[PDB]
Amino acid sequence: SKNVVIYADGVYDMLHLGHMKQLEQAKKLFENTTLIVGVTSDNETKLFKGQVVQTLEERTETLKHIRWVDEIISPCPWVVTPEFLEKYKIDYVAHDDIPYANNQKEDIYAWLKRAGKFKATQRTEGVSTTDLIVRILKNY
Amino acid sequence: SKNVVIYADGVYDMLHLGHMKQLEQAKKLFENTTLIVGVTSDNETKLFKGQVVQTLEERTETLKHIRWVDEIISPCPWVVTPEFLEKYKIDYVAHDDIPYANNQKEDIYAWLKRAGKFKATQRTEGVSTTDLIVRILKNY
Ligand SMILES: C[N+](C)(C)CCOP(=O)([O-])OP(=O)(O)OC[C@H]1O[C@@H](n2ccc(N)nc2=O)[C@H](O)[C@@H]1O
Ligand SMILES: C[N+](C)(C)CCOP(=O)([O-])OP(=O)(O)OC[C@H]1O[C@@H](n2ccc(N)nc2=O)[C@H](O)[C@@H]1O
Protein backbone atom coordinates (compact mmCIF):
# COMPACT_ATOMS: atom_id res chain seq x y z
CA SER A 1 0.00 0.00 0.00
CA LYS A 2 1.29 3.48 -0.88
CA ASN A 3 2.49 5.83 1.88
CA VAL A 4 0.23 8.81 2.70
CA VAL A 5 1.58 12.03 4.27
CA ILE A 6 -0.57 13.49 7.05
CA TYR A 7 -0.04 16.98 8.54
CA ALA A 8 -1.44 17.70 12.02
CA ASP A 9 -0.86 21.28 13.11
CA GLY A 10 -1.54 22.67 16.57
CA VAL A 11 -0.20 24.66 19.46
CA TYR A 12 0.38 21.43 21.44
CA ASP A 13 0.88 23.39 24.65
CA MET A 14 1.55 21.38 27.84
CA LEU A 15 1.05 18.12 25.97
CA HIS A 16 -1.62 15.83 27.39
CA LEU A 17 -3.59 12.67 26.65
CA GLY A 18 -6.01 14.42 24.25
CA HIS A 19 -3.16 15.55 21.98
CA MET A 20 -1.53 12.13 22.18
CA LYS A 21 -4.78 10.45 21.12
CA GLN A 22 -5.16 12.95 18.27
CA LEU A 23 -1.64 12.34 16.97
CA GLU A 24 -2.28 8.62 17.24
CA GLN A 25 -5.53 9.16 15.29
CA ALA A 26 -3.80 11.12 12.52
CA LYS A 27 -0.86 8.69 12.25
CA LYS A 28 -3.42 5.86 11.93
CA LEU A 29 -5.55 7.38 9.16
CA PHE A 30 -4.05 4.95 6.59
CA GLU A 31 -2.12 1.68 6.86
CA ASN A 32 1.12 3.40 5.76
CA THR A 33 1.73 7.04 6.68
CA THR A 34 4.22 9.73 7.54
CA LEU A 35 2.86 11.96 10.30
CA ILE A 36 4.23 15.51 10.06
CA VAL A 37 3.40 17.70 13.07
CA GLY A 38 3.54 21.49 12.88
CA VAL A 39 4.03 23.54 16.05
CA THR A 40 2.87 27.14 16.18
CA SER A 41 5.28 29.98 16.95
CA ASP A 42 5.13 31.65 20.36
CA ASN A 43 4.44 35.02 18.76
CA GLU A 44 1.59 33.88 16.51
CA THR A 45 -0.08 31.71 19.12
CA LYS A 46 -0.15 34.58 21.63
CA LEU A 47 -1.42 36.78 18.80
CA PHE A 48 -4.25 34.58 17.44
CA LYS A 49 -5.33 32.16 20.20
CA GLY A 50 -3.92 33.41 23.50
CA GLN A 51 -1.35 32.91 26.22
CA VAL A 52 0.89 29.91 25.65
CA VAL A 53 2.56 28.28 28.66
CA GLN A 54 5.58 26.58 27.16
CA THR A 55 7.94 28.03 24.60
CA LEU A 56 8.24 26.75 21.07
CA GLU A 57 11.41 24.95 22.14
CA GLU A 58 9.60 23.21 25.01
CA ARG A 59 6.46 22.27 23.04
CA THR A 60 8.62 20.95 20.21
CA GLU A 61 10.93 18.82 22.34
CA THR A 62 8.07 16.87 23.88
CA LEU A 63 6.56 16.02 20.49
CA LYS A 64 9.94 14.43 19.75
CA HIS A 65 9.19 11.83 22.46
CA ILE A 66 5.78 10.72 21.04
CA ARG A 67 5.50 7.40 19.20
CA TRP A 68 3.19 8.64 16.44
CA VAL A 69 5.31 11.64 15.33
CA ASP A 70 7.50 11.09 12.22
CA GLU A 71 8.60 14.65 11.34
CA ILE A 72 8.10 18.04 12.97
CA ILE A 73 7.84 21.44 11.27
CA SER A 74 8.77 23.94 13.96
CA PRO A 75 7.68 26.61 13.69
CA CYS A 76 4.78 25.92 11.34
CA PRO A 77 2.64 28.51 9.56
CA TRP A 78 -0.74 29.42 10.97
CA VAL A 79 -2.97 28.98 7.90
CA VAL A 80 -2.32 25.97 5.70
CA THR A 81 -1.83 27.06 2.08
CA PRO A 82 -1.79 25.06 -1.18
CA GLU A 83 1.88 25.98 -1.73
CA PHE A 84 2.57 24.49 1.70
CA LEU A 85 1.08 21.12 0.76
CA GLU A 86 3.15 20.81 -2.43
CA LYS A 87 6.30 21.84 -0.55
CA TYR A 88 6.11 19.08 2.09
CA LYS A 89 4.12 16.75 -0.26
CA ILE A 90 1.27 16.47 2.28
CA ASP A 91 -1.73 14.42 1.15
CA TYR A 92 -4.03 15.22 4.10
CA VAL A 93 -4.29 17.68 6.97
CA ALA A 94 -5.65 16.33 10.27
CA HIS A 95 -7.41 18.29 13.03
CA ASP A 96 -10.86 18.27 14.66
CA ASP A 97 -13.78 19.14 12.41
CA ILE A 98 -14.77 22.17 14.55
CA PRO A 99 -14.37 25.20 12.24
CA TYR A 100 -11.32 27.31 13.07
CA ALA A 101 -11.84 31.03 12.48
CA ASN A 102 -9.21 33.57 11.47
CA ASN A 103 -10.34 37.20 11.24
CA GLN A 104 -10.95 36.99 7.50
CA LYS A 105 -11.89 33.29 7.20
CA GLU A 106 -14.60 31.51 9.18
CA ASP A 107 -12.93 28.07 8.99
CA ILE A 108 -9.30 28.15 7.71
CA TYR A 109 -9.62 24.42 7.06
CA ALA A 110 -12.54 25.08 4.66
CA TRP A 111 -10.65 24.76 1.39
CA LEU A 112 -9.09 21.48 2.56
CA LYS A 113 -12.53 19.98 3.17
CA ARG A 114 -13.91 21.22 -0.19
CA ALA A 115 -10.82 19.71 -1.87
CA GLY A 116 -11.16 16.43 0.03
CA LYS A 117 -7.79 16.94 1.74
CA PHE A 118 -9.11 17.13 5.33
CA LYS A 119 -9.15 14.10 7.63
CA ALA A 120 -11.12 14.89 10.77
CA THR A 121 -9.85 13.79 14.18
CA GLN A 122 -11.76 13.65 17.49
CA ARG A 123 -11.01 15.30 20.82
CA THR A 124 -10.49 13.82 24.26
CA GLU A 125 -12.01 16.03 26.96
CA GLY A 126 -11.29 16.29 30.69
CA VAL A 127 -7.72 15.02 30.50
CA SER A 128 -5.84 18.34 30.32
CA THR A 129 -3.08 19.36 32.71
CA THR A 130 -5.05 22.38 33.94
CA ASP A 131 -7.82 19.85 34.66
CA LEU A 132 -5.39 17.84 36.76
CA ILE A 133 -4.49 20.73 39.07
CA VAL A 134 -8.22 21.25 39.55
CA ARG A 135 -8.19 17.59 40.60
CA ILE A 136 -5.26 18.26 42.96
CA LEU A 137 -7.29 21.13 44.40
CA LYS A 138 -9.28 18.36 46.12
CA ASN A 139 -6.71 17.66 48.88
CA TYR A 140 -7.15 21.11 50.48
CA SER B 1 23.81 -7.67 17.43
CA LYS B 2 21.77 -9.55 20.05
CA ASN B 3 18.69 -7.91 21.61
CA VAL B 4 19.01 -6.76 25.25
CA VAL B 5 15.98 -6.41 27.55
CA ILE B 6 15.97 -3.29 29.74
CA TYR B 7 13.54 -2.73 32.64
CA ALA B 8 12.91 0.85 33.82
CA ASP B 9 10.56 1.02 36.79
CA GLY B 10 9.09 4.19 38.26
CA VAL B 11 5.99 5.95 39.43
CA TYR B 12 5.95 8.04 36.22
CA ASP B 13 3.40 10.43 37.72
CA MET B 14 2.28 13.38 35.55
CA LEU B 15 4.77 12.43 32.84
CA HIS B 16 7.24 15.14 31.88
CA LEU B 17 10.41 15.76 29.88
CA GLY B 18 12.71 14.26 32.54
CA HIS B 19 10.91 10.89 32.39
CA MET B 20 10.85 11.00 28.61
CA LYS B 21 14.60 11.59 28.49
CA GLN B 22 15.14 8.75 30.97
CA LEU B 23 13.07 6.29 28.95
CA GLU B 24 14.94 7.40 25.84
CA GLN B 25 18.20 6.82 27.77
CA ALA B 26 17.20 3.32 28.86
CA LYS B 27 15.87 2.32 25.41
CA LYS B 28 19.21 3.50 23.95
CA LEU B 29 21.54 1.58 26.28
CA PHE B 30 22.36 -0.93 23.51
CA GLU B 31 21.96 -0.91 19.72
CA ASN B 32 19.11 -3.46 19.91
CA THR B 33 16.79 -3.47 22.93
CA THR B 34 13.34 -4.11 24.29
CA LEU B 35 12.39 -1.45 26.82
CA ILE B 36 9.98 -2.78 29.45
CA VAL B 37 8.52 -0.09 31.73
CA GLY B 38 6.99 -0.95 35.11
CA VAL B 39 4.44 1.39 36.68
CA THR B 40 3.91 1.37 40.43
CA SER B 41 0.50 0.65 41.95
CA ASP B 42 -1.49 3.52 43.46
CA ASN B 43 -1.57 1.79 46.84
CA GLU B 44 2.16 1.06 47.07
CA THR B 45 3.26 4.44 45.76
CA LYS B 46 1.12 6.26 48.33
CA LEU B 47 2.50 3.83 50.93
CA PHE B 48 6.25 4.08 50.17
CA LYS B 49 6.90 7.40 48.38
CA GLY B 50 3.86 9.63 48.85
CA GLN B 51 0.80 11.16 47.25
CA VAL B 52 0.40 10.26 43.58
CA VAL B 53 -1.60 12.59 41.34
CA GLN B 54 -2.76 10.33 38.55
CA THR B 55 -4.15 6.84 38.90
CA LEU B 56 -2.39 3.74 37.69
CA GLU B 57 -4.73 3.76 34.69
CA GLU B 58 -3.79 7.35 33.83
CA ARG B 59 -0.03 6.96 34.36
CA THR B 60 -0.06 3.76 32.30
CA GLU B 61 -2.01 5.14 29.35
CA THR B 62 0.44 7.98 28.77
CA LEU B 63 3.44 5.64 28.71
CA LYS B 64 1.63 3.91 25.85
CA HIS B 65 2.11 7.08 23.76
CA ILE B 66 5.93 7.33 24.24
CA ARG B 67 8.25 6.31 21.39
CA TRP B 68 10.82 4.52 23.56
CA VAL B 69 8.38 2.19 25.38
CA ASP B 70 8.14 -1.39 24.03
CA GLU B 71 6.21 -3.21 26.79
CA ILE B 72 4.60 -2.10 30.04
CA ILE B 73 4.19 -4.10 33.25
CA SER B 74 1.30 -2.44 35.07
CA PRO B 75 1.26 -2.69 37.95
CA CYS B 76 4.89 -3.57 38.61
CA PRO B 77 6.38 -4.75 41.90
CA TRP B 78 8.17 -2.31 44.14
CA VAL B 79 11.47 -4.13 44.75
CA VAL B 80 13.06 -5.87 41.80
CA THR B 81 13.78 -9.53 42.65
CA PRO B 82 15.92 -12.16 40.88
CA GLU B 83 12.80 -14.26 40.17
CA PHE B 84 11.36 -11.18 38.45
CA LEU B 85 14.30 -10.89 36.06
CA GLU B 86 14.09 -14.53 34.97
CA LYS B 87 10.33 -14.24 34.52
CA TYR B 88 10.44 -11.33 32.05
CA LYS B 89 13.98 -12.28 30.84
CA ILE B 90 15.33 -8.82 31.74
CA ASP B 91 19.06 -8.33 31.19
CA TYR B 92 19.36 -4.89 32.84
CA VAL B 93 17.38 -2.59 35.12
CA ALA B 94 17.62 1.16 34.40
CA HIS B 95 17.11 4.02 36.87
CA ASP B 96 19.23 6.85 38.29
CA ASP B 97 22.23 5.82 40.37
CA ILE B 98 20.93 7.65 43.48
CA PRO B 99 20.40 4.90 46.10
CA TYR B 100 16.72 4.11 46.69
CA ALA B 101 15.94 3.17 50.29
CA ASN B 102 13.23 0.80 51.49
CA ASN B 103 12.82 0.43 55.26
CA GLN B 104 15.00 -2.68 55.41
CA LYS B 105 17.34 -1.97 52.47
CA GLU B 106 19.41 1.18 51.97
CA ASP B 107 19.48 0.92 48.15
CA ILE B 108 17.03 -1.68 46.70
CA TYR B 109 19.04 -1.53 43.48
CA ALA B 110 22.18 -2.65 45.37
CA TRP B 111 22.17 -6.30 44.34
CA LEU B 112 21.68 -5.32 40.68
CA LYS B 113 24.82 -3.17 40.78
CA ARG B 114 26.88 -5.86 42.55
CA ALA B 115 25.68 -8.35 39.92
CA GLY B 116 26.43 -5.96 37.05
CA LYS B 117 22.75 -5.82 36.04
CA PHE B 118 22.23 -2.09 36.69
CA LYS B 119 22.47 0.51 33.93
CA ALA B 120 22.42 3.99 35.42
CA THR B 121 20.38 6.76 33.81
CA GLN B 122 20.58 10.53 34.43
CA ARG B 123 17.90 12.97 35.54
CA THR B 124 16.59 16.13 33.91
CA GLU B 125 15.81 18.80 36.50
CA GLY B 126 13.54 21.85 36.36
CA VAL B 127 11.20 20.48 33.69
CA SER B 128 8.44 19.03 35.89
CA THR B 129 4.77 19.94 35.59
CA THR B 130 4.67 21.33 39.14
CA ASP B 131 7.62 23.49 38.02
CA LEU B 132 5.53 24.77 35.12
CA ILE B 133 2.68 26.02 37.30
CA VAL B 134 5.31 27.84 39.35
CA ARG B 135 6.28 29.38 36.01
CA ILE B 136 2.61 30.25 35.31
CA LEU B 137 2.54 31.88 38.75
CA LYS B 138 4.51 34.68 37.05
CA ASN B 139 1.52 36.28 35.27
CA TYR B 140 -0.16 37.32 38.55
C1 LIG C 1 -4.42 27.23 13.00
N1 LIG C 1 -3.27 26.51 13.65
C2 LIG C 1 -3.19 25.15 13.09
C3 LIG C 1 -2.01 27.19 13.34
C4 LIG C 1 -3.48 26.40 15.13
C5 LIG C 1 -4.66 25.36 15.35
O1 LIG C 1 -4.30 24.46 16.26
P1 LIG C 1 -5.13 24.39 17.85
O2 LIG C 1 -5.49 25.83 18.01
O3 LIG C 1 -6.23 23.45 17.44
O4 LIG C 1 -4.23 23.93 18.96
P2 LIG C 1 -4.37 22.68 19.95
O5 LIG C 1 -2.98 22.36 20.39
O6 LIG C 1 -5.38 23.02 21.01
O7 LIG C 1 -4.85 21.25 19.10
C6 LIG C 1 -3.98 20.37 18.54
C7 LIG C 1 -4.72 19.07 18.14
O8 LIG C 1 -5.10 18.36 19.30
C8 LIG C 1 -6.51 18.06 19.24
N2 LIG C 1 -7.08 18.04 20.57
C9 LIG C 1 -6.94 19.08 21.43
C10 LIG C 1 -7.47 19.07 22.69
C11 LIG C 1 -8.23 17.87 23.08
N3 LIG C 1 -8.80 17.77 24.31
N4 LIG C 1 -8.37 16.84 22.22
C12 LIG C 1 -7.83 16.79 20.89
O9 LIG C 1 -7.95 15.90 20.14
C13 LIG C 1 -7.16 19.19 18.44
O10 LIG C 1 -8.33 18.69 17.76
C14 LIG C 1 -6.07 19.42 17.39
O11 LIG C 1 -6.33 18.60 16.31
C1 LIG D 1 11.17 1.34 43.69
N1 LIG D 1 10.24 1.60 42.53
C2 LIG D 1 10.94 1.28 41.28
C3 LIG D 1 9.07 0.71 42.61
C4 LIG D 1 9.82 3.04 42.49
C5 LIG D 1 11.10 3.87 42.05
O1 LIG D 1 10.77 4.69 41.06
P1 LIG D 1 10.80 6.48 41.31
O2 LIG D 1 10.46 6.53 42.76
O3 LIG D 1 12.24 6.69 40.94
O4 LIG D 1 9.78 7.20 40.50
P2 LIG D 1 9.96 8.36 39.40
O5 LIG D 1 8.76 8.26 38.51
O6 LIG D 1 10.19 9.66 40.12
O7 LIG D 1 11.27 8.01 38.34
C6 LIG D 1 11.15 7.31 37.17
C7 LIG D 1 12.43 7.45 36.32
O8 LIG D 1 12.53 8.77 35.81
C8 LIG D 1 13.82 9.31 36.15
N2 LIG D 1 13.73 10.75 36.35
C9 LIG D 1 12.84 11.31 37.21
C10 LIG D 1 12.74 12.66 37.40
C11 LIG D 1 13.66 13.50 36.63
N3 LIG D 1 13.63 14.86 36.76
N4 LIG D 1 14.55 12.95 35.78
C12 LIG D 1 14.69 11.54 35.53
O9 LIG D 1 15.46 11.05 34.79
C13 LIG D 1 14.25 8.66 37.47
O10 LIG D 1 15.69 8.60 37.53
C14 LIG D 1 13.71 7.25 37.23
O11 LIG D 1 14.71 6.51 36.62
TrEMBL record, chains A, B:
Binding site for CMP: 11-12, 19, 96, 124
Top-level division of the source organism's lineage: Eukaryota
Ranges for domain Cytidyltransferase-like: 7-133
Ligand binding (phosphocholine): 11, 49
Family indicated by similarity: Belongs to the cytidylyltransferase family.
Name of the protein this chain belongs to: choline-phosphate cytidylyltransferase
Organism whose genome encodes this protein: Plasmodium falciparum (isolate 3D7)
Organism phylogeny: Eukaryota, Sar, Alveolata, Apicomplexa, Aconoidasida
